[PDB]
Subunit: 726 residues, 4 copies
Amino acid sequence: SLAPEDGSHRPAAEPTPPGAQPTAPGSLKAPDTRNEKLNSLEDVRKGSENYALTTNQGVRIADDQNSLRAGSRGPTLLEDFILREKITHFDHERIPERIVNARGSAAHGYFQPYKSLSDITKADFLSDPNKITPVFVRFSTVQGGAGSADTVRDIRGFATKFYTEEGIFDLVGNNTPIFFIQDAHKFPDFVHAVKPEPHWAIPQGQSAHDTFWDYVSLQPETLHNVMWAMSDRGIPRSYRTMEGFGIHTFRLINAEGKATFVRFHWKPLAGKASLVWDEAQKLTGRDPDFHRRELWEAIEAGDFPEYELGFQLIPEEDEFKFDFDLLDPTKLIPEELVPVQRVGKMVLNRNPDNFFAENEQAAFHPGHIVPGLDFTNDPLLQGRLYSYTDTQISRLGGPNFHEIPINRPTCPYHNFQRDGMHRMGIDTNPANYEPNSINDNWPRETPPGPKRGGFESYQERVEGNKVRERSPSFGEYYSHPRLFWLSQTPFEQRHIVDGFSFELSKVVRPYIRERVVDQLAHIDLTLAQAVAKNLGIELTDDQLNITPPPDVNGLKKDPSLSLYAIPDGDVKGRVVAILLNDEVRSADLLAILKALKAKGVHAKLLYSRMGEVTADDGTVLPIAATFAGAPSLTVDAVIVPCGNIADIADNGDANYYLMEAYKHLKPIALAGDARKFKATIKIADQGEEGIVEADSADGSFMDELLTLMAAHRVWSRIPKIDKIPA
Amino acid sequence: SLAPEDGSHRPAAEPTPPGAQPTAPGSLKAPDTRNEKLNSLEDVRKGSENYALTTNQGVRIADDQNSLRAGSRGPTLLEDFILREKITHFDHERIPERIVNARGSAAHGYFQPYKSLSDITKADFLSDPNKITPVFVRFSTVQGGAGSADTVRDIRGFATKFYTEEGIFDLVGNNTPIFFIQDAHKFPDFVHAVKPEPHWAIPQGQSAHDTFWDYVSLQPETLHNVMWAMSDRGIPRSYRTMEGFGIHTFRLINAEGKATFVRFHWKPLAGKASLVWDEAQKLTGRDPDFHRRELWEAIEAGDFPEYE
Amino acid sequence: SLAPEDGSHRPAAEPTPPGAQPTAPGSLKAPDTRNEKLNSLEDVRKGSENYALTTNQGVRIADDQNSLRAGSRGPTLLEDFILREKITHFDHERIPERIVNARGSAAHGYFQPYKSLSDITKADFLSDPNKITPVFVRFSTVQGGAGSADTVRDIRGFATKFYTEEGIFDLVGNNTPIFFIQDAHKFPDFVHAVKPEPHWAIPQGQSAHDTFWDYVSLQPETLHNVMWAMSDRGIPRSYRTMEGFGIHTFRLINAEGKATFVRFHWKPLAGKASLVWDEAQKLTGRDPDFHRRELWEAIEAGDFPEYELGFQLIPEEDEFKFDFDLLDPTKLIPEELVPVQRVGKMVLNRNPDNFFAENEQAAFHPGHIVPGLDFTNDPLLQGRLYSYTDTQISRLGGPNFHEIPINRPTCPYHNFQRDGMHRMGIDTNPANYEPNSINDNWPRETPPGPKRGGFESYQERVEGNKVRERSPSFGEYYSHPRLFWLSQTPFEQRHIVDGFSFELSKVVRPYIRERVVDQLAHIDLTLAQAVAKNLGIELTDDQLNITPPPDVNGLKKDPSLSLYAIPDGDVKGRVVAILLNDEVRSADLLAILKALKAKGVHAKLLYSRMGEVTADDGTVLPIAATFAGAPSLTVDAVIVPCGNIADIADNGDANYYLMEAYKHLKPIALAGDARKFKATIKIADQGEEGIVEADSADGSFMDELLTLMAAHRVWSRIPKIDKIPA
Amino acid sequence: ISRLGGPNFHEIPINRPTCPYHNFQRDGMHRMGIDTNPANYEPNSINDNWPRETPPGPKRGGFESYQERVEGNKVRERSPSFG
Ligand code: HEM
Ligand code: HEM
Ligand code: HEM
């Protein structure tokens, strides 16, 4: 029952490209990657090699293949304590998944600021460019269960736990800069509406159903984040290629006591990139684990996800200077009005060891702040402060969830709290209360001050009556949707129109569709008309005369709201499919791989069967996957080298592979006789931008391909794809 | 008055074909379809039309749109007990999913035997062809979570709760007539091998990964059920068009105390029918809820799943 | 600083007698005491001196006196995350108490065998006289809640966790050698019957109610342990002065595979000693924590509880050599037939640091055996094997209770079990199943062998039909109760009579009393008559002629069954009340205290008030307690020295002190004018056995007193106590 | 929530209101009530927005807090009048 002779069961503990080795727990793949938090988990890491198999009480097991029975065909005996312990632990494996964001993928890394921020905040983790803060990040979808698919259309969660020297700070954000609703009291309404409908629990991972669009049509506050969801923001290529936002306005407090309003941003250093809808939806079927896999593999390859932290900063005296309320989380602050100041860089550089222990049990909370940070009255933030504490007690089984290893602070913690289910800490303090004399009052309160001080809330002025009332300043719902719409490129606008049209086609009750279209007519007539036409709906004269909402503080657009208007492409860590034949021209392949390797782009070698093929020069080429097994959905570009093209010329899967990649706007490159495939994608002989072609794969061919890949997708091909049957 | 004036928001309370009307809870879609179990659930069914919105304590709510704050732009106050109750119930909605067969779709129905089986079993539910036994049946996949896809390649579970006059009998079977392993002591081994791998929790809903095939290769007792899983049996067209089996040999005991060995079968009266692999895998993407949907809609249409 | 200047808040970290210092956490009191288990807990112990007060996330708290509010008389704000974490942890402090034995008191210690027992067992912890095994022992009552009283009449539990090098072994026993019932199936019936009745949840800590005696009257198998319960066995003086028993027959298994039947015994090295009923019951009121307190204070004083482990051993071929069935847990094995062989010694030498974390969360299981031990078919033990695993999952919150620090093995444990609520261990094994090739099949099964081998069950022959049937061999109910009765001294027999009489008086339905009396007439006529008389019941002529049950294998008694038949007193750690007056004769006191100190006997100095008094010669005498504050119930004897006897001669409390102690059969000693107190307890001028008296507290006054204390109580005084109104 | 095992402790018989209770809350451990409402959110059109909010009033009205004036700074401070 043993390992192969050749040690091929065990992956190399060295960075390797996706597919080259079986993936492995982080501490075994990258044992020399350390930080303070990863080190501190060492008390609970358990190995296995050379150890005897035992019960949980330490008793060695002789026979782990059989129950104890009276004779070998007899009844199982109740005294089999080994069987019952093993079955009981199995029987009790599951815990409640998260009520939202149950589907998520996490990794370890570190953060450091570029320069001390002491002028605007006394937060210790921002005080020194050479003081490094361990982090654990979990990225997530929102709607679906923990076993749902990665590449659904949904908002994404982006939660970062900072293990600072002055306490855990969790920054619990999303990949769009606003939320659907204004006041936390409506959260259960909204989430019930987007989640599977309660009679039949359908659909998973999708807003494309009646109840979501019903709530939307009756709650126009939702429309801004709905625009972002229906755009390609809702289908990121990778967690590495999306933006992050805290959404709410928070405060920074400096040593002088000055408060500055702040909104938090993460910039992906790999650039912004999203799938297209047909590709994203098909990919939930071909690989429901695509984003989880891609994140794990990037870290195993050395393509560490990196993000830049950035702050939009607004002085206290400028609180009311915009035509939107800063405390309204359905409103974004355009970068054109308030730029993002770069603050520091976060690098995710190691995977967990056990997904359940570290990812499933991690607990983040936006209420987890530190001195130098504070809240505001944002009525959605205010309610979140209550919710995460409450849900985690039942999800994680009691109030000692901070003792679960992943959640533990790395800085000191001491207090008079005691007991609770699964209490780990054995307190020796003779006192469990303060004030006490019997322990000289330790642990003691600490006055606030410039560093290492106790937490004190900023003394904000509160004046008003106890009311359940939405601020009048929050009652404007169309101008930000329209700013977003106007800031998208034409192809991005088309994909938005296609998102609304596809989703509303799945709404069974037609008046719900009509009411949503009426809401679109309040944002932009061109958008409303394009959706209406796809739905066979005709706008009335009144609808055509709805006056468009005002510009946002004179802005007619802000290109930072577009994924693509401003190029920010980075090809490192992207992947190319190379479609092999049984007599590959080894000169083509040499040049291809050399150029890819120079830019940090990975390759997957594909064929019509598994095993190996032999190139013209005797080189044996191992096959990663079949054309069916690793579809074009899972790669960024396709390259077909010369060789014996007749081997694959009439293979349906190989032809379809090119048709699918072509449809989904990916760069394709064809060398030598592979150019015969130009017929399948049915498109000229002078060639076309987006298809690289040459007698062979030279320097120039690869440079062209690599340039297209830096632009992510071939948008100019869009008019050509409605004709292809794929 | 948010409902459309034409009453088109509400599905007709009569059988209708898939897609013709919005789907609805069973007691509203088919109020006249009754059995003893469904009738006995009446004490806990809760309606809604014409009733005031309240807390769980019965206090009427005036404004379910806003938290209580100090000023309309001020901080939320700890005294907002309406807000806290609503968010707390929300916060605690989830329970652990089933350790296996977490993904499953269920319906109510009824069973009747063709003739009294008193000669071979004193089981009351099988004693009289005029004796009707309410059932609740759940069909499931095995490996994936409750939010995983329906048309994966997997064994299917087929569990029937018989509410008999002498006790609940649960017949907890699968859609193939054998299981992968011999002794329950190995069940955590086998299930761990098929389930997502522990470092990264991949893949969902699939035995197509190293640990499953490592275990199979080292445990040849698995091969028989593996053959079934790799065949089109692993990808049924519908829960209505697959076979059921209790797998184990049980005993029937008659009044004279004679034991007869029995294995249980379910025959789908709609026939046996499966998907093909490329279709099944793509369907997990285009509609991960396809079997759940198909079952619900068949019952709404009057195409009742029948099994012998 | 709130501590006093003089440092009197902090107990001395050295052995001190009961009452001399405040009690403290074990690791603070006795930092120098260590064993392997205590050392292994070090990583979870938490200090407090010199640390800042923080949240559980490590954020320093500035003001731990106030909620955050809008204005200092304003509403509390939801954003107060410091308040909500502190209150939430508080809100969730409790866990379910144990279904039975909820009330218990526990200490750390160590065990060592006297010699290797490798000839009869391959159990590692018994293999070497040099091998020391850490232990954790919890003693308990059975019926009452965690907050019920110690000195109730009840069975006591005695549970020992041995942290061996081959696994945790739990020896989960009682202070009597049999149980009430035969088959585990009836455990909920019996326990429901003894526990508080379900309508009104009365009575706590008492079998004196209808449902208990109803069950007993209908289930004669219970009578054996009921006899024990009604005897003074039911009210021990201290956990230090009771026997322990595993009750069931288990097996020892040697390296050759030979099985030997075994029953386990603990012998108290401090000897056997019990309270009398009126004393025990009042003491539940004056100090409901008396046993818990006494165990803790003995350990702080260095009076470490010591027990000898012993085995009754029966060869496999002698299974049917007795009049009763070895597998019947309502039968004892008389020591006259099978002697107890001494095995080793256990010393409890350290208190916990945190009662909840170490005591409340400890989980013991009679199914936790190690290779070299095995079970038998005892049908009560059989069912136990199921129950403790089940209960502990809900009590302790999931299947990883073995990771709670007190429960962890000190030896290695590795297996393929994963996940579960509150999972601490982070597994790095690429595999979570076996057989596996991807981790070379580690951790691996180990064949059984002479040492360090895997667990294999003894291949006992099983033959018969699947039946719910009691063995006919178990169907004898009276001969063990009779053996027990005949082995008791006449004063122990009287206290048994009075236990049944008092409990049956509290049974409201008269026919239930009648039915119990009829059961007694089947055991012993003298017993039945005496109880009957106290209940106003007359035996019928038929009851009067019930033939008594036969002797047990020829024995008409066994004095090892009696608490007192064979003197085994030890005065070390017993306590004496010394009743002071305002002008004590200092020569009497020096001699008293010097004599007490030499035998390890503690003293408490008592007066009509707190503070101090001054002896005839200037010596300042500090008062420990008032007569009312520390009643005679709490001491083993009373000495009254000479002095100004007039000062307390008419003190109602001081007179009553002597009356109570007289009634409860405690030695009393009176010196010089303290002899005036003879009048209050009606002692004749020439004195009586059990009252020491003289002109001064010595020559042989202290030897006489200490001699009486060695005999525990003055049994000969029993006829005299009825005429004393106390 | 922890003592009684989940968020449906109001369905424990002794705790239940004797007056009507209807809302959009769903699920939670040991859920007894089986909701037939097509909607589990409001505002909804698919159940005509039932169950519905009720304005506060002299009898049978919805709960509205008394509109007490709050003026002060966010402080963790004991009122001097309590001293
Ligand atoms: C700005 C709007 C919000 C954002 C950016 C957001 C973000 C997130 C994220 C990223 C997670 C997953 C953390 C993880 O990976 O474990 C999460 C979980 C959760 N959120 Fe929020 N959220 C928002 C609004 C709300 C609201 C209004 C509430 C309720 C008042 C709420 C309650 C919850 C709950 C109960 C969880 C599960 C937490 C756990 O089980 O540990 N969220 N949220
Ligand atoms: C012939 C072999 C088996 C068959 C046909 C089978 C069938 C099933 C089915 C259909 C379900 C889902 C019931 C539902 O819809 O809720 C289920 C659940 C489950 N099974 Fe089995 N099973 C088999 C073997 C085993 C074994 C050997 C074990 C462990 C010793 C096991 C443990 C479980 C557990 C713990 C659940 C979850 C039950 C719950 O949470 O209610 N099964 N099984
Ligand atoms: C020879 C007869 C028995 C003896 C000597 C005995 C002894 C004990 C003791 C000493 C404890 C307390 C352990 C501790 O201090 O934490 C205990 C707890 C317990 N016992 Fe037994 N017991 C007996 C019979 C039974 C039976 C027949 C059952 C059920 C079939 C049972 C079920 C339990 C349960 C559920 C607990 C609570 C365990 C926990 O919560 O950790 N016992 N027993």
